[model samples]
Target chain A: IVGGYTCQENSVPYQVSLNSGYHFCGGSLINDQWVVSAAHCYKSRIQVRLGEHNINVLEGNEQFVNAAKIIKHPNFDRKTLNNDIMLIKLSSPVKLNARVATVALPSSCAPAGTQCLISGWGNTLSSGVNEPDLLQCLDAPLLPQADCEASYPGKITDNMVCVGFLEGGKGSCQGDSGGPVVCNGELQGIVSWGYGCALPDNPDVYTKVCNYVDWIQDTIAAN
Target chain B: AGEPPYTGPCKARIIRYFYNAKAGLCQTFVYGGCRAKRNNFKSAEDCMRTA
Candidate 1:
């Protein structure tokens, strides 16, 4: 995360790191057995590390589990990046505690101007920042629809929402995709894409979580 | 491409459903009293069957 600081130990309980050997994307533990991430993070195999603050350390509090199933949005569009969310069912349910717990999905859309938290192990700079060992956290506000639409004219869609400073500087970066955008204790968005990290007038775009609440619940219930 | 929810610049709050093509499901969105979009449906059932 650009212009963000190291997260307090155990502060982001739901945050998880996606690994195939190295951290590539982040995810949020929405339930004991399910993780929500970006469909773009899909790979032949994904390992989820929960309760992770520093990727380089053993951090006895961490739980490692392989994905049992990866359900990417069937309509995920690579060109437009609409519906960029994905659901991962863990091979086994991880034990929840203070250091690892579930985040509540939003019941409604977070209104514009809502302050939210973006946390991840994403690169801190647009060009280069040694991938940080510690998780980074940034506070950002949701941009109004008009402002967001203006920034990425003909690109933004209802499935997406923007958050960060319109003038740029602070926002999510690479390796942050699939992480949570928490507002008022609810998971409102999922890190998806953006224009070169946090560039001017280019806020980080996210998968609008409120729109998928039903699909999430229904999918979980049926499976 | 299907129509996206457009809560026109108005104050009225009407709960409506639209077929979110991405999710392949009809989802709720608030609609203003004016300028209804094609994706807007009066009910979830209507939205599911049509979209």
Candidate 2:
């Protein structure tokens, strides 16, 4: 994320790296066996890395696990990017500790103007390159529904939430897609899309996690 | 008459084709598998015919 600082080690224990030999997207460990990420991050042969802080270093605390199954939201629309969340079932559950843990899902939507944390290994530069090896964290405010819709016109939807400075300079980027947007220790958003990494008038968009809490619970319960 | 190939923001990789309206050619790109527009095609043959 651009205009963000390097996160303190282990501060984001719930963050996971969606990897196919390298960190490509970020995810949240919602439970021992399930990961929540953007459906757009789906690819064959993904390895989800937990307890990751400095991605390039061994760190010793990280656990790499393969996906047993991947379930993209059935209604996910490629054209509109609606319902962009995905649930990844781990082949085996991991042990949670100080360096690895599950984040709680949201009980309700984060109200407008709520301050949220967006953490990821996405591009740290606005030029769209310079992906960071360490997790980056940005504290951005959730935009009001009307303001967000106005920024993107027909692109915004109820299933999505916008977070960042309306004037830009701090937000998620390409590689940050599927990362978590946490508010009050609750998982509220998933990095979904935006016009650019962090550009003026284009607040970073995310999948509204509150909208599908029931779907998430049901999927985990049945599967 | 088609749009350029779009590799969406997501990281998933799938080989796909698109019609380059300017060059009048069908080209291959790694599609991210989601958030694609009408320009995306399954194959060069499909892209050629559609264009």
Candidate 3:
């Protein structure tokens, strides 16, 4: 959620709700049974809801599945926020339909300044926006490492990507965590962390998906 | 929230967020309930020290 508005039905099909009793994080369905999310979002008991638009109300296209298993990067560093990616396996293959689909992972990192879209049911207001039944989406512009590094100072890592407004005050905030950052229709990043929601000059940080594609493939094969 | 699910220095530890008045550095270990001395920091480059 960089800057927001209500998301239309099936606007971002790959997007899913990561719920453990309640929606804790956002996730992306990569296939019939696998989802990619923020490693720090990992919980012992998790479930995913695909084909979701209005999270508060049940929809026909939505499919809920228990996470059969979950794995975070072996080298995930919470202090530094590296290796923030996580993979989750659904207990059963999701039944694909008009509202359920997978998003392709980018072969490489989207070049700097790439335009992107991120959708989730994260916070709606800076003072904690009122969450409605519908999902929220925002248009975010990718920022160069130098600019991002300026905002975060020494926190930007090669495995992370930062994107938001330049003059400040437009970026993801709390509760939008573990969502996808799609650049050019392919998933390029995962919303991992951010300072304050909609603060000026502070860009939201994401777990770089390009850096962990190999590991994701390997983990899926292993499981 | 409540107490973190885990905190420790065990045979296998996870590097976690630990902050203080002086600095916010990677001084924490993988402690789902414990810590590990060796795997505490994969590389010194991993953590950022801000003034």
Candidate 4:
């Protein structure tokens, strides 16, 4: 089982950079050829760089892959920011290493309060600032539907899952959007949104991976 | 400069008007009679000039 923890310097990951020099966090790998990320990350030109802990320095291997295509969720809405998940097709695939490995998706349903792990190179604090190189992670419990509804209300649709600390001080941050929330070594959710990073009375929200099984299957099959 | 003439596209007969800044009055120009399809650039220009 994957334990909730932050990404350390040893867990150097890759990120896609826009022309404007901003980087968005993304999953390392999902399959032999596919890397999962968020659609909002595509607002600008992107180039994938790997094997670097610090955004400024490259210590290992660096590969640039032009996005061959983007498979955004059909239900995704710009106004409401719902269904924010997306899959990026790379022109070529990267070799998997310790720093890069595919996390399994949930094979079956998991009950509420299950401990899950979330990792990303997001802000350490609730502020929107991103870490220079290291990825941070936190442990949060799966929120029950009742509590999630009470906190997020109508916005927490069925396609989403909520996880975070009740007292706050633990949750995904700004750059962490689009990363994974892994449970039992399976990918459960994609960091979508939240009240704000680590805010009290709010839990981090994610796009439920189980809900998009058909979409994911169809996209991979068609591609 | 004077409204650049409504010479682009129109299905129905369109009335042309100009805003008179000094007099603060609206000026109307009516074309005799011209049948032109919507978005007919050349015909609309001719109709406007004749009016």
Candidate 5:
């Protein structure tokens, strides 16, 4: 959660931290062995920490595993930042329990103005490396893609979904990338990038999960 | 010491092999050096050491 809120430990079961010593990015478990995050997060030693509510402490429900494999979207372009999503295979299947469960991925579109929840271990403000005492969560309202393009002119593409508050101070920032933006119990977005934290008229961008349904299904099936 | 503040490569950092000549071996971890650094390469067996 980038903005922060009332979250009990393990309440957001699918949330995972793609940690390499620090919770630099967030991830979500779509299944027992696979995760969905920003493709740009592809790293050689990225570890998956599930059922974790706090990065600084390991709770009883925490599950740690090394990345078995990473499959970035075939068309992902760092230059233009398209298809900025990836799937992670865990070394082994996780044992689902009360504190750990998979979040439902969307089978349909989440229209504009949809209210979604996003959480992660990013800095409280846009400018620090201080991870929060607990995983943070915030509600982000989906903004029209057209409006998004106007905000980050010549950058926001259709592949990206816009989300944030019109008043600012309500979206993900650095280190919050790759976390889940869930709506109505379904996964709708993957925190991708932004124009410097939460700024007025500059909403956070995400990799639209609904747009990559085919790719996600095929990749998971083949792997 | 860990490299200074970085948004990581492509706004994200991944685990990569960095062969530290000082250690005479490759260390696998997230490389945090932003823009400039030597020896802290991005590959190991492939040998991507900074000249």
Candidate 6:
């Protein structure tokens, strides 16, 4: 039961509902034909639930679509967990509704220390968790490369973008992996890893979507 | 710390350090760089001869 903010009344955001008997996280619809999400959420048995607010109640008349294919970053390493971004291709183009719309991809470069918003259905509090059926959103700030390197040392690689609260606490956790970290209304990062759910001194890490723009374009073109 | 004479393989190039529980600090041990079969411990005389 993941809970967080849904789209404003007019804007329709892409939502992914994993078939693993859980709503792990949320993503943005990049195009009528494509959806963007975290690479860790890539699985054979997943579905993209779009255009609706509640799974139990279809108040917004949203469309539920099956994912025909999933394309995760080739450099994604489950061991070191590098390059943790992925894209999902819907079987068919979805009709845009008032609550469902696509977001633009970030340009080639993004400014450092940029603050972004991340939304998900993950646990709000770490201990004794419960999943909210509704989406939730929170603010996260992009961390500088040097600070990230100093904090995580060898763990921060060129393929990832670091963001979170420096004091820790207040970040995306657990089921939030593979969701969007949006900045200036553009998809900048993908939720990746962290030490714990919003703990002090431990910030969340994300995959730099802009860094892998070429790879994403090439893969999507090839497929 | 007193300087013990360096007596190991190749002038004590590969000294092994271990935590000394009694001394409450890291202790260094010197041994000749001899290739021994796994699970084989040589006597002090054999170690000195190899050294």
Measured against the true two-chain complex, the DockQ scores of the candidates, in the order shown, are 0.02, 0.26, 0.04, 0.01, 0.16, 0.01
**Mind giving the per-residue lDDT tens digits that candidate 6 earns over A1-223?**
1223554533336554444444544666888878877665666766777765555566757777788888877777765667777788889998876667777788865677787878766656644455555666776678888877876779888877777767765777555566778888888887767655665665677778888777777877987
Best by TM-score: 2
Lowest-scoring 10 consecutive residues by lDDT in candidate 5 chain A? A122-131
Give per-residue CA lDDT, model 3, range B24-47, as digits (tens).
344542232122233333344443
State which candidate, 3 or 4, has the greater TM-score. Answer: 3
Q: How far is candidate 3 from the true structure (C-alpha RMSD, Å)?
A: 9.2
Please give each candidate's TM-score: 0.81, 0.86, 0.80, 0.72, 0.82, 0.74
For DockQ, the strongest prediction is 2
Choose the strongest candidate by lDDT: 2
lDDT of each: 0.84, 0.85, 0.73, 0.59, 0.76, 0.63
DockQ score of the complex predicted as candidate 4: 0.01
CA shift of A157, model 5, Å: 1.5
lDDT of 4 by residue, A67-100 (tens): 6677778777754456767887767887766655
Alpha-carbon runs more than 4 Å astray in model 3: B1-51
2 or 6, greater by TM-score: 2
Judged by TM-score relative to the true structure, which candidate is superior, 2 or 3?
2
Going through the candidates in order, what is the number of backbone clashes in each?
0, 0, 21, 2, 7, 15
Identify the superior model by lDDT, candidate 1 or candidate 3: 1
Q: Per-residue lDDT tens digits of candidate 1, residues A1-223?
A: 8899999998999999988877878989999999998887777799999999889999799999999999988888866778988899999999999999999999799999999999988778755554689999999999899898999899899999989998888887767888999999999999887766678988888899999999999988987
- RMSD in Å for all candidates: 14.1, 3.7, 9.2, 15.4, 5.4, 15.5
**If you superpose only chain B onto the true chain B, what TM-score does each candidate give?**
0.86, 0.80, 0.27, 0.27, 0.40, 0.32
lDDT of 2 by residue, A36-154 (tens): 99988888788999999999999799999999999999999877889999999999999999999999999889898999998988768776357678899999998898888988899
Model 2 chain A worst lDDT run, 10 consecutive residues: A122-131
